[PDB]
Amino acid sequence: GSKLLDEAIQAVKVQSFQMKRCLDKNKLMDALKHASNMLGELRTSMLSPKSYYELYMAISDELHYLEVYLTDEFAKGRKVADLYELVQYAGNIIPRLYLLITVGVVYVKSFPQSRKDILKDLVEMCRGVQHPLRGLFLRNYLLQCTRNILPDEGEPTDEETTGDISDSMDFVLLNFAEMNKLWVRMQHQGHSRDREKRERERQELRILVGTNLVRLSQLEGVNVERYKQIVLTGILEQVVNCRDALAQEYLMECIIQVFPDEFHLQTLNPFLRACAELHQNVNVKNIIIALIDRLALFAHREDGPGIPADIKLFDIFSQQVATVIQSRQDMPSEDVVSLQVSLINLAMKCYPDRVDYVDKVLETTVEIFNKLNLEHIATSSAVSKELTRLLKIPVDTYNNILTVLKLKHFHPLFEYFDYESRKSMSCYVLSNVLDYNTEIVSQDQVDSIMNLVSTLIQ
Amino acid sequence: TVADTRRLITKPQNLNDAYGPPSNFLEIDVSNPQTVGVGRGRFTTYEIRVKTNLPIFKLKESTVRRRYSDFEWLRSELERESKVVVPPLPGKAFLRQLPFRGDDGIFDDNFIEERKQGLEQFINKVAGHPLAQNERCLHMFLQDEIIDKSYTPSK
Amino acid sequence: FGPICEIDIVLNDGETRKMAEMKTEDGKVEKHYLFYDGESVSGKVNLAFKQPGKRLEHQGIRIEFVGQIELFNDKSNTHEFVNLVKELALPGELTQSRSYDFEFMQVEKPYESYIGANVRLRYFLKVTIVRRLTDLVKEYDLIVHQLATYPDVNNSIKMEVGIEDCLHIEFEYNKSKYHLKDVIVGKIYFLLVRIKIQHMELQLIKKEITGIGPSTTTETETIAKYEIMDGAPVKGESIPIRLFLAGYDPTPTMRDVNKKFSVRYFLNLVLVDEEDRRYFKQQEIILWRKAPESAEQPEMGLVPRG
């Protein structure tokens, strides 16, 4: 019907009108009685995640008018006594905790001495809502209300405040673990014939879980050593143990995106060891590719430190990509080759100098094709698509096309193509050597040009 | 102190428990009504399809065929030993078996649909009841392929 | 005409002394002076004479301090547990207004005032002017509260209950004995969950027991329904309880008062499943006054897992 949604938003607008009305008269307890009635609409199970999201947003906006009423009232010396206790009298838990979170943040601002205990209390008392949808949205509201008030390092030096960066890291990691738990739990609720609908619903709600990792990256006190020992250690513990492909794939990608490259460079072997532990239905190729792509943009960014000499990127990724591929049960051959492309791409952008790296990928690529007892690869096959894209990168990217001809293992890969693609690829290489004018060719490279013609004509 | 934040200390939840699938799965569908016989001795049967992870049930997946009388037999067997006040069935419709009606009687489609829903309603309330899960009559009705009325009630 | 005389009682500490409220029938709230065991009750009886010219022949005037228990709204069941008398005047006449002093020394008041369903316990001063056929009588009500200090022993209530192979839980409340403005701090811990729980709540239940032996009537009232969980937990899940008692204004526990009645409080923990089935466990808690300085909805009791 979709009326339920609109009926609720109508009811919300009625109660939120009478709330602000009472707030004008300074009738707080009567305002809260309507705030609770408004919040009562969040108890429903009849709305979809999209419908419920819309209802949440309406109610979140109205709660802000209450939260700002309290914060000013408290700032101007007219603080309401026992208000923390009073909102817990609510007989229904969902109104109770939304009101408790609202009053909690007002207390943190107004009474800095109570900051550590109230935050720890709010994250802990949310355990009351075990329902996935409603629990996720409650814990999300906790995370938004507390955005500006969590402990951090660049803070005003008021020595009556409580709680440090450690308490903030535990606050968000704890909320993260509970939200992920609820989010995964959605996989098993309802009837067994709505499996594709559930995975669709879960997909929509992924942003709620990922905001926790976003919040961890926003903490100025989260340095590289805290990331290594606490934050990534916390995050990876949930990721590998949740045993859920949808969350694993999302959360690993979300790490790459949210944290800086300074942190990624110190944590490569832990991150890639985790990639090998993920569920078989996870696109591990996409995780590894997105990481390499991010480090490539970090190599070419000047007015930054660049890539240290002790972090041997090529040796790390060559070795771990191999190990990850070994961990997969049935990885398509095209995907294995898509990874060779990113290993080339990495080596080109992070080490333009070192041609021997680019050739070692091609040498290993040969070993892969050689090892694989392959029937003839048609031009229409996806393996051919990638091997073509692989070989075109050195030819397209390099300044001087002479340097490509000096590669030892560039040409032995031509063997494995279709007849049609040997002709096409030999032509594409030879065409580019005329499109840009030739200097005199050395002994090694004279041999390579003849081999390219011999593949073109025959 | 401005706020009472007292809580009892809790034992952290083990991650196999937090992320493992729940141990309360039980869905029963009543589907696919079919006429069995010809003429006078016709009667409808329904497929009763069970999926579960409760260890008390012998099969994690089962499909069996059942008559409305089988539903009557189960309710009767439960009313005698279980001490579970048993929910009502959707109703024997004696007057629908009378001849020359303005519908197909006991094989009217709106009738079979409303009966079917009532039977699914009934079996889901009964199968989820803890005291009903002990009785041998329930497991017989849901997972043996044919009911044995000459049985000795146990458990 | 009206009455010939009006009787008014005024306590000697009627300005400084604290008052207190009682909830009676249909939401009415009286206010009366508050007293405690051992305090003296003293004041004045003031007779305002209303018909000047006329005279009031009496055969004595007395004041009585009374504490009594009233059962089932029946005057013939009233028992006085405390009765003190002061004679104020011998047989005589009254032609004008007059006042008399009274003092009850260090008065015993062993029980707290209470207004229930089948029971009332009340204290009052009663003035009586004795006339030849009809006495003039005036009652003056008083609240009495009974106090206590922190108990010697206060053990947390902790227990493992369940429906075998369906639901196993451990619950814990932080005390056995809560004062009227105290807080139930507790937790529920889930050991086995093979049912689909919709919600869980904690209830505060008041029981008034009247009569002796097989003559027992029990009146039950449910003072609080406090949701503590929304949704289906799994094993190893802990649920925190923080219930403030100030929000329900209960009376203290009263146990075998004059061997006539009891008022007892119970925490009732209720879990409701997706098909509206209901699983419960009831625990008595003592409340005390702090000295200031069914086919639709089947029910199954959770049994101790010993």
In words, what does this structure look like?
The PDB classes it as transport protein. Keywords: protein transport, retromer, sorting nexin, transport protein. The assembly is trimeric. Structure of retromer VPS26-VPS35 subunits bound to SNX3. Chain A is Vacuolar protein sorting-associated protein 35. The organism of A is Homo sapiens. The complex is a heterotrimer of chains A (458), B (155) and C (306). Chain A is built from 21 helices and no strands. Chain A has one domain. Chain A has 458 residues and is mostly helical. Helices cover 69% and strands 0% of the residues of chain A. In chain A, helix 5 packs parallel to helix 7, helix 18 (382-397) runs parallel beside helix 20 (419-435) and helix 20 crosses helix 21. In chain A, 37% of the residues are buried. The longest helix of chain B has 19 residues, at 109-127. Chain B has one domain (1-155): PX Domain. Chain B is of the alpha+beta class. Chain B has helices spanning 15-19, 68-81, 109-127, 130-134, 136-143, and strands spanning 26-36, 43-52, 61-67. Chain B has a three-stranded antiparallel beta sheet. Chain C has 306 residues and is an all-beta fold. Chain C has two domains: 1-149, Immunoglobulin-like, CATH 2.60.40.640; 150-306, Immunoglobulin-like, CATH 2.60.40. Chain C contains no helices and 24 strands. Chain C has strands at 5-11, 19-23, 29-35, 41-49, 56-58, 61-71, 79-89, 92-94, 98-104, 114-115, 119-129, 136-144, 157-163, 167-173, 177-179, 183-193, 197-210, 217-230, 238-244, 254-257, 261-273, 278-288, 299-301, 303-304. In chain C, strands 2, 3, 6, 7, 10, 11 and 12 form a seven-stranded mixed beta sheet that branches. In chain C, strands 15, 17, 18, 20, 21, 22 and 23 form a seven-stranded mixed beta sheet that branches. In chain C, strands 19-16-14-13-24 form a five-stranded antiparallel beta sheet, with no helix packed on it. The termini of chain C are far apart. In chain C, 26% of the residues are buried.
